[PDB]
Amino acid sequence: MQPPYIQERLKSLNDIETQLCSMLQEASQVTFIFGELKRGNESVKPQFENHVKQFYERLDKSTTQLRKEIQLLDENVGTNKKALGQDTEKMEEQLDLLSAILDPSKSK
Amino acid sequence: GQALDAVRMRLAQLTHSLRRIRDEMSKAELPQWYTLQSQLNVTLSQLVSVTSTLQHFQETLDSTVVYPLPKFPTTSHESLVTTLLRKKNIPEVDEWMKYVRETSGEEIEKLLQQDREITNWARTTFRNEYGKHDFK
Known part of the structure; x- marks a missing residue:
């Protein structure tokens, strides 16, 4: 499996696009609510401020976190290799098989 | 005549752009999406410029009075004259805004001022x- 650092990096990226999807959804609801606000019912007027504020705060911190990720790219620089040992490990397992062949009491 | 000349040249280039987008859509194979977007945006902004310039010079167009040429023969070209003379909209747009007005449907004035105050309030709220x- 990959080293953990890459794991939380990909988790943060996934959070980033989920936040973008949430921003698009909230844009959909604010566009929806503005229609009836133009229609002329004032009951949903208080919800408009909350929706706008949450939309803007969702737009800002997502870009901020993505900026942090791109910054991490800046200092992460400088921080078949398996083949060099690959034959060796193959060697090992083959002899292990011979051991299983060599002992008739373990072939069950 | 200067205003109508500018209208002429701009509408001619708009028609040229329409002919362009036409003969690149008429091909049996659709080009890349990006070229279509570029053509769409260019032609559509050009239509915006057409609308704005036609807005600017309404007085010159209105002042002009239409009259057929003495040399132009109407006996043989009456069909051509009637073709340009007619101005009634295409019907589908007509019932289109008829259904639109049907759906839309001192009271009206105070709703209008209420819309004014909602607009101003929303503008101020988004400025805040x-x-x-x-953002910088």
Whole structure:
């Protein structure tokens, strides 16, 4: 499996696009609510401020976190290799098989 | 005549752009999406410029009075004259805004001022929201 650092990096990226999807959804609801606000019912007027504020705060911190990720790219620089040992490990397992062949009491 | 000349040249280039987008859509194979977007945006902004310039010079167009040429023969070209003379809209747009008005349907004036205050309030609210977070 990959080293953990890459794991939380990909988790943060996934959070980033989920936040973008949430921003698009909230844009959909604010566009929806503005229609009836133009229609002329004032009951949903208080919800408009909350929706706008949450939309803007969702737009800002997502870009901020993505900026942090791109910054991490800046200092992460400088921080078949398996083949060099690959034959060796193959060697090992083959002899292990011979051991299983060599002992008739373990072939069950 | 200067205003109508500018209208002429701009509408001619708009028609040229329409002919362009036409003969690149008429091909049996659709080009790349990006070229279509570029053509769409260019032609559509050109239509915007057409609308704005036609708006600017309404007085010159209105002042002009239409009259057929003495040399132009109407006996043989009456069909051509009637073709340009007619101005009634295409019917589908007509019932289109008829259904639109049907759906839409001192009271009207005070709703109008209520819309004014909602517009101003929303503009101020979004100005405040933009000012809340530093975007630079």
